[PDB]
Every structure is written in structure tokens, then in C-alpha cells.
Paper text:
Two of these classes represent the [name]-1 complex in different conformational states, designated the ‘expanded’ (E) and ‘contracted’ (C) conformations, both of which exhibit an overall resolution of 3.1 Å. We observed a second conformation of the [name]-1 complex by 3D classification, designated as the C conformation. The [name]-1 subunits in the E and C conformations have a similar overall structure, both including closed ion channels. In the C conformation, however, the TM10 helix is bent approximately 9° compared with that in the E conformation, and there is one additional helical turn of TM10 in the E conformation. Upon successively superimposing the [name]-1 subunits from the C and E complexes, we observed that in the E state, each half of the [name]-1 complex, composed of [name]-1, CALM-1 and TMIE subunits, is rotated by around 8° compared with the C state, by way of an axis of rotation that is located near the [name]-1 H7 and H8 helices and oriented approximately parallel to the membrane. The movement of each half of the complex—when viewed parallel to the membrane plane—thus resembles the motion of an accordion, with the cytoplasmic regions of the complex undergoing relatively larger conformational displacements compared with those on the extracellular side of the membrane. Indeed, in comparing the C and E states, the amphipathic [name]-1 H3 helices move farther apart by approximately 11 Å, thus underscoring the magnitude of the conformational change. Nevertheless, these results illustrate the conformational plasticity of the [name]-1 complex and, reciprocally, the possibility that deformations of the membrane may induce conformational changes in the [name]-1 complex. Of note, the E and C conformations generate distinct membrane deformation patterns.
Here we report the single-particle cryo-electron microscopy structure of the native [name] ([name]-1) mechanosensory transduction complex isolated from [name]. The two-fold symmetric complex is composed of two copies each of the pore-forming [name]-1 subunit, the calcium-binding protein CALM-1 and the transmembrane inner ear protein TMIE. CALM-1 makes extensive contacts with the cytoplasmic face of the [name]-1 subunits, whereas the single-pass TMIE subunits reside on the periphery of the complex, poised like the handles of an accordion. Single-particle reconstructions and molecular dynamics simulations show how the mechanosensory transduction complex deforms the membrane bilayer and suggest crucial roles for lipid–protein interactions in the mechanism by which mechanical force is transduced to ion channel gating.
Author numbering:
A (entry chain C), B (entry chain E): 18 to 201
C (entry chain A), D (entry chain B): 75 to 459, 664 to 883
E (entry chain D), F (entry chain F): 18 to 63
Amino acid sequence: GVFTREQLDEYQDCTFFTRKDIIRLYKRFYALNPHKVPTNMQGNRPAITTLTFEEVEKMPELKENPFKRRICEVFSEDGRGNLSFDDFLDMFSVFSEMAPLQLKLKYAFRIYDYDGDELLGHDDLSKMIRSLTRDELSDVEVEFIIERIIEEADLDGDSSINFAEFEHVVSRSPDFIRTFHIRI
Amino acid sequence: GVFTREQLDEYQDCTFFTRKDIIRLYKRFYALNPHKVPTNMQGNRPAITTLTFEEVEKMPELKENPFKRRICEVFSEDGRGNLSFDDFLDMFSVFSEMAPLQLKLKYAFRIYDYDGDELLGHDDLSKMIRSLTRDELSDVEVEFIIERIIEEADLDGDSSINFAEFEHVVSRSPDFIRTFHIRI
Amino acid sequence: TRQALLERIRQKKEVIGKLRCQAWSMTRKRRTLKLAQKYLEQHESKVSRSHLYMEEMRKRARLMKRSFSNFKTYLIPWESKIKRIESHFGSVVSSYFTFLRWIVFVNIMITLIALVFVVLPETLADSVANEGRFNRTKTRKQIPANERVHADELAVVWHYDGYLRYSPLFYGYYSDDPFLGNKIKYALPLAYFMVTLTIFAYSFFAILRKMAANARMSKLSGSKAEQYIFNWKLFTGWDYTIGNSETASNTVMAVVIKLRESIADIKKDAHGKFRLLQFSLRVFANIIICAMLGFSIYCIIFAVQKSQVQDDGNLFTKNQVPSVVSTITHVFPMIFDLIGKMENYHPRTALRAHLGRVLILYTVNYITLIFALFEKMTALRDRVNNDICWETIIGQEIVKLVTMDLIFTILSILVIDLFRGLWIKYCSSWWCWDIETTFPEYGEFKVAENVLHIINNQGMIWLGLFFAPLLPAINNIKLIILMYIRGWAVMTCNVPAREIFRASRSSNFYLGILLIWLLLCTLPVGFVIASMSPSRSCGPFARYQHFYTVVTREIEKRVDQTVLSYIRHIASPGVVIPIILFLILIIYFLFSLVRGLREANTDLQ
Amino acid sequence: TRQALLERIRQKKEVIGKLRCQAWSMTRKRRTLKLAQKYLEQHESKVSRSHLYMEEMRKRARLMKRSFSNFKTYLIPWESKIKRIESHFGSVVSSYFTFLRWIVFVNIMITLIALVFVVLPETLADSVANEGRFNRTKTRKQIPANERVHADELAVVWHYDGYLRYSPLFYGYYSDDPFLGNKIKYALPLAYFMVTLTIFAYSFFAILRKMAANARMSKLSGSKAEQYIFNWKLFTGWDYTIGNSETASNTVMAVVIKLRESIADIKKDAHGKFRLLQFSLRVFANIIICAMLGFSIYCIIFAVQKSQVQDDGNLFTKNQVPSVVSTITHVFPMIFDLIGKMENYHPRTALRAHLGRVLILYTVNYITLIFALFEKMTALRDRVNNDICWETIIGQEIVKLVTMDLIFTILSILVIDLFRGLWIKYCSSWWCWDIETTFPEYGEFKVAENVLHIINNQGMIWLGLFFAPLLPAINNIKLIILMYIRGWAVMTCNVPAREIFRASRSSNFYLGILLIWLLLCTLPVGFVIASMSPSRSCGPFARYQHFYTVVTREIEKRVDQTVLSYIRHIASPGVVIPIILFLILIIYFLFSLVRGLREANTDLQ
Amino acid sequence: VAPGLRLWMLIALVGGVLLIMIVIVCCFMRIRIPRTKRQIDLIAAK
Amino acid sequence: VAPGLRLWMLIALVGGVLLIMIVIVCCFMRIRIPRTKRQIDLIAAK
Ligand SMILES: CC(C)CCC[C@@H](C)[C@H]1CC[C@H]2[C@@H]3CC=C4C[C@@H](O)CC[C@]4(C)[C@H]3CC[C@]12C
Ligand SMILES: CC(C)CCC[C@@H](C)[C@H]1CC[C@H]2[C@@H]3CC=C4C[C@@H](O)CC[C@]4(C)[C@H]3CC[C@]12C
Ligand SMILES: CCCCCCCCCCCCCCCC
Ligand SMILES: CCCCCCCCCCCCCCCC
Ligand SMILES: *[C@@H]1O[C@H](CO)[C@@H](O)[C@H](O)[C@H]1NC(C)=O
Ligand SMILES: *[C@@H]1O[C@H](CO)[C@@H](O)[C@H](O)[C@H]1NC(C)=O
Ligand SMILES: CCCCCCCCCCCC
Ligand SMILES: CCCCCCCCCCCC
Ligand SMILES: [Ca+2]
Ligand SMILES: [Ca+2]
């Protein structure tokens, strides 16, 4: 209707969404900040229409997530500290329930790594444990947890989990596709 | 009877054989060379009673094997170019039909490697192909065969198969436990 | 030449199809999509006519499927409701609501199947009945003047007598005329039999399709798992659906707990203790639980027996079997949980034992109820010989059970959740003991018990839909009411549990229990159809000596006698019994084979 | 303290148990064994009394098992024979001989089961029969004086008439007295029924145990394989059993050929060709093959029909059904192979098609033979009403079929292998064409056809062992003769094939075909037992209206009538049919689930 | 209006209209009975 | 010795003893009819 169809066909071909989901997400994005989002949004405007990280993290589905910053950063475009409509659609098509297990595993691994070197180092594990727990476990407890995780999840003796072993170990979890889910 | 029981219990605990198999193999070993094998064989004599590689390769079960030298060398004792009764029992307990798939795979890998570095290099593959074929394939054919085998059987990009990938690829062969078998 | 072109076109089409399942940015995805689209557009001329037509019709089918999905999304209800429940309470509480919505869809499909082919043709035929008709069916569609006055008594209506008895809701209302009329020739008894068969077939098909979709994709890689304690409790320790502050703090505390006793248990690894008092308490609990199960059986049997009246001698005492069954079903689990608390087991094994005991109670109660109802029907038919209508009576019993179960569920929601919460809020300051932190803390959702309620109700619907054609239609309203009342109760009166465990951490556990219940409920319907004989003054099968005759009478109209006699030897006991034994043996050995293969699949990885 | 000691003892025991399966030298193995033995000897005092007794009895059981294995190895025959055949011809030729030896062991076990409990008690009772006996059984155990003279006619003996008819080999010879005698009270009819049931149960159990042993260990890792062409054809390209020079050269040539067309086929990857002549030849071959199958059916039916005489009108024409069946079975595969050669398919797909056609021919012939025999027996019983003995007659038919099959196999071995080899050796110099290199090259072993012969013969034995108690005893001699003649023929007349392919490269293919044959053969026996009625002057069931009565008559002697009547409702068609349909549906969906799991097991590796 | 043949319809109608009014009232409201753990801890501390 | 009642036993006995003698003879012998491929190639070359 208001938008060109070809955009809708492209979005449905790229994402898991339908026309209703695209329209609902556009309404939510516009309601996030009406000043920085125009009404008519035909053309390359979705690539240039942008919002900051604070506005996206203000949303209820992301506000209470300890890894809200990581979720915003993983789906970020070439611009740093920013999110566009295409990034919004990536974020809410990866996180949806209809997404396959492989995509969830891959983006979860990309989220859990802060440096971004395709390797789950000790510092990343400690940072994510302290983010999830909010500094309630003792330092000795954190070290013990990381040591056990490395022992039972590292097979190459590298003291750092990678994509293969992480995917092997947490894809047989009967609670991953149930937990790693955001409804919108 | 003639031999002490404790030796027979030890041999049954270590090998797959029974008393009848031990007696039959002892008779065959004595018939291989009566001069170098004493009648009464109680004590540490099995570790010191020894035969050369030519006598063992003279047997019908090993005479036509292209890898007879490798089979004799893998089971060889500390002495080079020698085989004792314990080596005979190892060789004919590994090769038997009752042996598990893992033992057959492991000793087959040890046989197929000539240098003995736990790695299946290109030279080992070429040597074993030319031994099995008797230099009937052309050089280009051998190179093509080795290239395809490396491409479809190497996953780490090392251009040299190791224990893990060899075991993964030839243990699903429905003809390995049928072929890798010697009856005696 | 052509082979390479076809291979390239197939590869490009496969890339386009699997485009969404790759982790690329939308710019990269759009680039690849446009590149592949241009490649296919320029390469479409290289293939032959057959391949071009195949691709064209495949594209048309894909476009139609996409349009159908776009239209279908518009009709999915309770999106915001489940979204809110998920945000406030978690992703294991909302599993019950997603399960209930799927059950609603299945029940609506069953209702449409039984309404298009049975109820609507009969109503249309009744509305246009001429003088020639309306007399052959007056004895079943018109309430007699003797009992017409007493149709409104608050006990005739409550027992589904009066006008409801002579309504399309029950089996005996439908005429046994072989054809609806001229120029149409619609066989209604055959429609009845085929619809009853089709509903069970579709129930099996839908349950198995859901099970396959959940197992082949979701939990396909989830099998063959070994140990992995800390990684499971850490990487899957946060529910991403939760968008509530208090629930998030509760989840953080739960994760800290789980990790702390994880390290505590893995540290000592010492398990030495033996107290005779604890063992005596455990055996006493296990004995009293079996005593309560026996009491349940005896109460159900007594309740069925004491309802020995068919004429209107008294109705304040006839309606006691639905009340007794509902009371047992809705009260005994609470006592089970109390005895389990006294038992003092580990929380996971305590929950598993409680679920097992509830399942055993439900199955035993259902079996004894069926046996008592069948014995009562047999006794009534024997004493009868103005012929009685045992099918309509069975339908009435099942409908009354469903209605009283709904009433008891509403009362339980009102008392356990609302009134208890109000009492704790407004009376914990001055109570004798600290109730707000004591045993009745504030109230929590019970996903497993509620799902078992849904499964038991659906089993009751499946059991009695042959005798009550409009039982799924009533179940639609019952399920909608249940969804709304459960959502409101959980939103208003319940608090998020500190940590909630799962029976097997699988979505197919409840589907498997539902499938077992479907088999258990289709066994007695098949037995009734094969063994029992219809009534001679009721329903569409009043002209036959069996229920299945209306089918076989038409099979014999097209098949010779000799071939039929040859076929009738496949139903020999000496051919069925070896086949059953062979299936049992093959299942038993294939069980060990499959368990070994599944165990070795992880080892070979 | 005690927990650590128990764990260490368990670990040491586990190390000792799995010692042989590790690739260590004998010195290292001896060192580890002595170390663990000393550790256990010094640590045995740390455990409690219960653990000590458990370990002591486990050690005693292990010692007894080892002694039993040592004694059992002494009784395994045909070790050197199979060793020589393996050395000369390979490891796929010797698969037939190992299969035949296992079949011999199974048949010997069946013979012992049917000989301890049936034949021996009856013979002992007959030898001690007093004047009171020997008159109730004279009509079945004594040949009448009318036909005693004509007992040796070379046609009475060849048809198992005369003395063989009144021998323990047949059903009608056994008395129907409920007890063998006083002070013993041995129920012989019950022994007969229970032995016939036990033989089938043990056959199923042994076949399934062999299948499980071959699948859980040998081919457990062999499943879920993908591509791997060159590595399979290279690392498993040499048969290690071969110890012959000519066979080794043949194997080297075969490996070279395999690799050569491997690279040749992988190189071009181009498959474009369509000749109308080739397609016409293929469809003509497929039509003539079905024509030959129909001719086989018609010939079998005609042969059974024309043997309509029961009295000794003529015997040179009555013995034509075993000859016809044997001729078809032993000749049609040759024509199948000739037609396949004309078809010009790939060798592997040609072999698969030939095996499938042979299996279809065998199954169809067996089914039509059973139907014709059953129809003939029904017609004979109807025309009878001095009552005839249809069970003894069926037993005679099966025994004659087995004997003629043995004769035809011996003749085929003598002609195809011996005489053809001699003709090629002594006549290829001056023949019209080079036969030594032409179509009849020199003769080769056919493992699949011979294994199918063994399976078909065992199916015939299973079918007719209820009517002929001593049919497995005869099959023992038949199988021993077959083993010796096949070994001699392959050693003397056959040459090693250039390359021999396998149907599925599995050892459980033939076991699965054998299990299917066992089910196919136990169906008619169960139908006979459940449906047909015994003879009133034959066998041990002459006092009952059914075969199974002798069982139920004793079940009713201990079980009440009311509970029996309640149980008798489990055999309703309306309970069995939903159960059968549920098993069908669960098998169908579990098939897709298992195939997906097996496919993804390799992917997850 | 007989008690057993006309009164119960009147009672049911009154109950039904009251139930409809209550449901509509609680449709536009967001009641939340239990108090958060912070309030419980504050009350316990007093 | 009737042809149909006594001759066939004599024929069977003669055949059985001849068969036993043949089997015993071929028991201590290692006949091998086909010639090796080398001999076939030599004959073809001539
Ligand atoms: C298709 C799915 C939804 C199942 C619906 C039930 C089907 C099996 C039932 C419902 C109505 C039935 C039809 C009703 C009337 C007729 C006309 C007459 O010639 C007898 C058979 C026939 C043709 C019936 C065949 C079975 C039938 C089609
Ligand atoms: C054990 C395996 C080998 C099966 C053997 C067949 C079994 C089932 C058969 C063979 C002989 C049978 C017994 C024969 C006679 C008696 C004595 C009398 O009281 C009736 C039952 C009883 C006791 C039978 C029970 C079943 C029986 C033991
Ligand atoms: C573990 C389950 C315990 C359930 C206890 C329910 C208690 C219900 C009490 C109802 C009180 C209603 C009157 C309130 C007076 C202020
Ligand atoms: C492919 C199978 C072909 C089988 C051909 C068998 C030929 C048998 C010929 C028998 C000749 C016997 C007389 C020999 C005269 C020297
Ligand atoms: C209607 O029913 C009455 C019952 O007495 C019958 O007499 C009448 O014939 C019926 N209708 C017709 C066909 O007139
Ligand atoms: C043996 O059989 C004869 C048949 O006439 C019978 O008369 C006799 O009584 C039987 N034996 C006995 C019991 O004497
Ligand atoms: C009546 C006493 C309880 C009987 C049922 C116990 C079921 C336990 C199930 C455990 C499954 C792991
Ligand atoms: C009668 C024509 C042949 C019918 C049977 C063909 C069986 C082919 C089996 C192929 C299995 C892969
Ligand atoms: Ca890192
Ligand atoms: Ca190497």
C-alpha cells in the first residue's frame, strides 16, 4: 500500500516475517522516535534511517536483558553504535521462534563473545558470568565455574571454546531454543 | 599338561585365544623351525625364543600379502627383524575375526604407515598403492587417486590423514571387518 | 552444456531458498538475492521446455503458498495475551498457553468436520421435512407432551434433559432414513460413521504431525546428550523472553542458586546416610498414597452404582458421579504434593514422582469409570428386556462430566488463586504465623497439572463424541473460557516461581501423553462399534444389527461373495496372534538396537 | 574411605576385563595384568562382606564360563574346510559356508528339542506297551496286512509310503492317550503342541539374537556412511584371508580395474544417451520375465491339481509336483541371468535386479504352492465325508519336496560344475568357438543364489515340521551332505571370479530374508492350528475339535469362567483393528524419525 | 413465578448480567494482588 | 527276484557301495580341473 511491494518481497525473502510483521515492526520503530523516522520510507531510506543504542535498549523486550548491549552490537550495521531498520529486522528475525537451531546457535555465540575473535576466551566467560549473575558469586566460585566449563567443553586443549565445540555442547540442551527466544 | 597353567591363564587373559588355539599355534611355531624352538618351553623362553622375518613370511597366510613386511614389523618385539611367540600370538589375536573393530582399525593404521610417525603422508599412500597394485596403474593415475583420497579424507588441511579421520572414514566401510581377517 | 546450465540453475535456486537461514547482514543478503535473481533471469532461456514449465509452476506454487501464509497470519488469536504472559512469567509458563491454543485449533477443526457433514445436512433436512416426514422422526425429535411441562426444573436442564435431549447435540436425535431426500440422496448414517472415523484419524494425524515437526527440527540435535552440567546451566540459564524487573531478579537468584549447589554437589561427591525414621516416613507415604488411590477407585465405583435410577425418581442424588470424579481429580493432586513435601526428596525427583502419581491416578480413574459405565449400560439393557437409548444416555453422562469439570476448575481458580492471594495480602500482618513466607507462600502456576487437565478433558471429548456429535462444539466454548480465566488468574494472583523444573525438558512429553490418551480412548469406542448392538428406536443406526453394518452393507454391494469369504480368513486368531507377537518381538529387539545406535551416535561424533 | 576403595577396585576390575581389547605388547599387557592382580589381591580386604561375596561369585562365574568356552571350542567342526575355502577363494565365498554351518547348528538344536520331548517318550512308551495298549494304537502304528506286501515297490518307498508312513517321522503315528502311563503321567499331546510352539519361538530368538550380535558390534559404526569411494576401494581393497597365488593376482587385477573405472566415471560425469533399441530390449526382457513368472504359477497349480489321486492308481505320475517345483527353482535363475546379460545393465544393478527377481519368484512359488496344497486338502476332506490323514499327507508332501530338492541340487552340482569343467578342459582346443574365454567361461560360485536355496529349504522345513516331527532330523543329513558336496565342488571345479559384488555388503541381509521367510512360514501353521480341525483317527489330537484345545482344556482347569469370559473380550475385532492401525501408524512415523536421526548422526559427527 | 419452574431463570439472568458487568469491569483494569519481594522485605524489616 | 519288488534293492546296494568307494577315493585326492590363467594364456599364444 503505502510502501512499494518490491521492498516487502525482498524483506520476506530475506527474513522470516510476513507483511503484517513488517508493518507492525515499522510502527514500533516509528513509535520509538517519530522525529528521526519519516512517514514515507520508500527507497534506500531504511539503510540511512537510524537510531541510537539507548533508544533500542529502552524497549521492554531488551531492557532487562543483561546482554542488551551485545545484542545491539552484534546486529549493528557498518556504522558503530547505531541501528537501522534492516538491523531491527535482523535482530527480530534471528530471535523469533521460527528461526532454525543453527542460526540461534551462531548468533548466540557471536553475542557471548565481546572481543569478537571467533573464540570464547576466559575473559569473555568471566565477563558474561559476572553480567548474568550481577556480581553475587564469589571470585573463587567464578574461577571454579570457568575451570569446570573449560574442562568439560574444550577438546583441543586451547583453554578457549570455539564455534564447533560450543555448538556441539549447547545444541543438545533441551532448553536453548526455549530460552533464546524474543517475541515481537 | 606339558606347559605350566599360569602361562595359559595369562595368554587367555591377554589374547582372544583358548587353550586349544594356544597349543595349535605353538605346534605351528615349532613346525616353522624345529631347530630354533625347544620342545619344553616353560618360563621366560617365549620372550627369548625368536624367529626371523623370512620364516614368518614363508607361511601361506602371509606369503601372498603385499604388506607382509609391515605386518611382521608392526608386531615385532624390541629386537629388530625378529618375531617371538608373544609376537605371534599378538599378530594372530589382532587379526582374528573375534577381534573388535577398534583394534582392527588401529593396527591397520599402524600397518599402512611405513615411517611410523602416526601420520598418513603422501609418500606412505603412494608406496601402499604401488604395493597393492604392483605398479600397474600409471603415475598420473596414482597422483589422481592420492589427490582424491586427500580431498575426501582430510579435514584439517594438513594433506596427511591421521588416526581420527582414517578411523572415521574406513570404520563405516561394510567390507573392512570382512577383509581385515586372518584365520588360523 | 545443458547439464551444467541445469546444475547452475538448481544451485542458484537452492541458494535463494535457503537465503534466510544464513547469518548475513541485510545488505549482503540483498546483494546475494539480487545477484541470484539476475542470474536466473538471464539463464532461464538455456533450459528446455519441460524444465521451464516445471520452474514456472514451482514459482506459481511458491507465490500462492506465500500469499496463503500472509492471509493465514491475520487469523491467529491471543498473540498479545501470550506475549504478555511470556514477558511477565517466563517461557515455561507460556508453554501451557501455546499448548491450549493448539488444542483449540484442533478442536475447531474437529467441530468443522462434524458440523459440515452431519449436523448441517440433518438440520436442513428437518427444516424442509414434508407431511410424509416429521412422523417417522417425531418419536425422537419432538419432546412428548407428558414430559414437555417438566422440561424447565433446574434439575432437568442441569442433567441435559428436556429440550437438550431432543437436540442435535445427542445421537438419538438423528433420523435413520437411508437418504436425506430426492434429487440429493445423502446417506446420513454413512456420514455419521465416516465422520466419527475421520475425527479419530485426523486427531491421530495432527498429533503425529506435530510430534514429527517438533522432533525432526527442534529436538533432532537435542538427543544423544551426555553430562554437560555447567554449560547447560550457564549458557541456557537466562530466559530471553522475560521483560519484567522482578522476574529478572528472580531468575538471577535462581541461576546463582543452581550454580552454588552445582559446585557444592560436585565438590564432596560423598553420599553416606541411613536414618530409619526417614525410610519409615517414605514407606508410610507410599502406602497412604496407594490407600488414597484405592479410595478413589471405590468412590468412583460407588458413585456410578448408586445412580441406578433411569426414571425421574430424584435428581439431587443422581448428579453425584461428575461431582465425585471432579472432586477427586481436582483435590487429590494437592494431597499428593503435601505427602511429597513430607517425604522430603530432591525437588526434581519429587516433581517426577508427583507427576507419575497424578498420571497413575488419572489413568486408573478413567479406566474404572469406563468399566463402571459399560457395566451399568449392560445391566440397564438387560433389565429393559419403548426401548431405552443407551447411546444418548452415555453422551449425557460425558457431557455432564465435562460441564462439571469446567465448573470445578473455575471454582478452584477462584479459591486457590484469588481468595488465597487476597487473604495473604490483607491478613499476613496479624496472622498466627507468617503465612506470606510459610507453606502457603503466595501461589504459583502448575504447568504440568494444568496440561494434564487439558489432556484428560480432551480424552473425555474423544471418548464421547460418537454419542454426542456437538460435544466438540461445546468444548470450544469451554476451552476459550479456560484460556481467558487461566490468563487472568496467572496475571493477577500468581507470583513467578523461584525455580521451576521440567518433567523431561521436552515439548513432545505432553504430546506423547496425549497420543497415549487418544489410543486409550479409541479402544472402547472401537469395542462399542464392533461388539455392541444399536438401539431400535434411536439414532441413524436403528435399522441394523451392528454399528458397522451400514459400511459393510455397501461393501457387499460391489464385492463378490467368494472373494469376500476368501478375505474373511485374514481375521483368524491364528494369523493375528503371530503377527502381534512378531510386532512385539521386533519392537523389543529394535528398542535395544535403537538405544545402542543413539548411544553410539554421540560417541562417534 | 570405603567408597574410594570400592571405586578403585571397580576400576581395576574394569581394566582387567578390557585388557585384551587394547593395542599393547605382550610384555606391557602382562605387566598391567600383574599390577592390577596384585592391587586387587591387596585391596580385597578393604571392602565389606557383601562386596566380597559378590566379587567371589563373579570370579567363580567367570571361571566356569571360561572353562565352558574351552570345552565348547573342541566341538566346532569344519574349521580346516572353511579355512581352505577361504584361503583359495576369498572371504565372500566362505560367507556361504559359515552361514550353512550356523544353519546346521540351529537345525541340530531344533532336532534335539523335538527329539527329547516327543519322539523319545513315544518310542519308550511303545516299547513297553502292555496287552492293554498296542490295540488302541494298532490302527496307526501297524501297517495293515492288505498293504504290507506292497511296502517295497520302489514307488511306495520313494513316496514315503509303506513302513515310513507308520514311522515316528509323521504326525499320525503318535497316540492320543492323555498320559504315557502310570507312575509317570506324561502328557504327550501337550508335549507335541508345546514342542511345535517352542521350535518356532527358538527359531525367532536365535535369528534375532544373531541379528543383534551382528548389528550392535560389527555394523554399528558401519551405518550412516556417505560417499567415501576411493578410500573404501583402496583401504578395503585387499582380502587378507587369501593365501593363493592365482587368487592374489586376480585380486590385484580387480583392484586395478575398480580404480580405473572409478577415475574414469568420476572424470567425465557426463551421461547423455537414448537408443530406442536398448529401451525396447529392456522392456521386452521385463515382459518375458513376468511371462515366465506366470508360467511358473500356472505350472505349479497344474502340477498340484493333476495329483488328484489318493489310492494307488499310479505313482509314476503322482510324483510330479516336487519335480516341477525343483525344476523351476533350480533352472529359472539361469534364464534370469541370461536375460539380464541380454539387458546389459551395470553389473551391480544387474545383480540387484537378478536377486530381486529370484526372491519374487521364490516367494510367489511358495505362496501358490501353499494355496494349492490347502485347497487340495480341503477338497479331499470334503470328498471324504476310515477317515483320511491330511496331516500325514501334508507331511509326506513336504518331505518329498525336500528330498527331491536335494536330488536336484546334487544333479545341478554334477552337471553345471563338474561336467562343464571337464568339457571345457578337454574340448576347448578344437571347439567351434573359444568356450574357455566365451560366455561359459569356466564356472563360478554363486553365493547369493546358494544362500537363497538354503533359506528356501529352511522355510520348507519350518512349514512342515508340525506334521513331520522328524523332518529336521532328515534335514541334518541333507545339510551335512550339502556342505560336503558344495565344498568339494567349489574346490575342484570353480575358478575365483574376477570381481564379485555383494547385495548390500551386510551380513544381516540374508538373516533378514530368513526372518521374513520364518514369518511367512509360521502364518499358515498358525492358521491351520486356529482354524482347521484334527482327524479323528490320526495323531495325538484325535480327541479334540481343534488343535489348540489340549492347551485351553488345561487353562480352564485352573481359571474361573467369569474371568475367562471377561478376558475373551480382548480378542474383539474392534480392539485388535485399532491396535494394528496404531502399530502401523507408529511404525510409519518412527520410520521417518529414525531415518532423519540416522542421517543427522553422521552430520553431527 | 413458581420456585422450581420460574425463579431459577430469574436468578440465572441476574447472575449472568452481574457476571457480564464484572467481566467488562475487570477487562479495562490491570489489578495485581501480590506485592513485590522488595515490599515484603521492607514490611518484614519494619 | 521280482523286478519291482527285489531288483531295485540290489541296484541300490550296488550304487551305494560304488558311491562309497568313489567318495573314499576322492577323499584322499586333491583334483583340480580348471587350469590357471597362465596356462590359458600360453595355450592361446601357442
Ligand atoms: C473428506 C473428509 C473431510 C472426510 C469427510 C467424511 C466422508 C468420508 C463422508 C462424509 C459424507 C459421506 C458421503 C455421504 C453420501 C454419499 C452418497 C452415497 O453415494 C453414499 C456414499 C456417499 C458418497 C458418502 C461417502 C462418505 C462421505 C463422503
Ligand atoms: C523347556 C523348553 C526346551 C521347552 C520344552 C517343551 C515344554 C514347554 C513342554 C514339553 C513337555 C511338557 C510337559 C509334559 C507333561 C506334563 C505333565 C502334566 O502335568 C501336564 C503338563 C506337563 C508338565 C507338560 C508341560 C509343558 C512341557 C514341559
Ligand atoms: C499449597 C496450596 C495451599 C492452598 C491454600 C488455599 C487457602 C485458601 C484460603 C481461602 C481464604 C478465603 C477467605 C479470606 C478471608 C480474608
Ligand atoms: C552360464 C551357465 C552355463 C552352463 C553351461 C553348462 C554346460 C554343460 C555341458 C555338459 C557337457 C557334458 C558332456 C561333456 C562332453 C566332453
Ligand atoms: C403422519 O402420522 C400419522 C400418525 O397417525 C399418520 O396417520 C399419517 O399418515 C402421517 N402422515 C401422512 C403420510 O399423512
Ligand atoms: C486287544 O484288542 C482286541 C481286539 O479284538 C480286544 O478284543 C482285546 O480286548 C484287546 N486286549 C485286551 C485288553 O485283552
Ligand atoms: C503409587 C506410588 C508411585 C507409583 C508411581 C511412581 C512413578 C515414578 C515415575 C518416575 C519416572 C522417572
Ligand atoms: C519382474 C521385474 C523385476 C521386479 C523386481 C525388481 C526388484 C528390483 C530390486 C532393486 C532393489 C534396489
Ligand atoms: Ca574471546
Ligand atoms: Ca607417514
